């Protein structure tokens, strides 16, 4: 959120999770932005397909 209620942001690569907690997705597809802070510098919480999870927010970008 940050500066807002709503957060969106468009995948450009495509990003595999390595653990079961991490988000998974390909590149070109609106994400959800849970929390920009999750007690981790340069780490993204969102939520794809009823799930959420960590990951370098470099494989997307937000619109704001």
Request: proline residues 3%.
């Amino acid at each position: 959120g940050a500066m807002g209620a709503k957060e969106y942001c468009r995948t450009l690569f495509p990003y595999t999770g390595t653990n079961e907690d991490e988000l998974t997705f390909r590149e070109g597809e609106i994400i959800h932005l849970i929390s920009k802070e999750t007690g981790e510098a340069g780490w993204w919480k969102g939520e794809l397909n009823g799930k959420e999870g960590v990951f370098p927010d470099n494989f997307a970008v937000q619109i704001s």
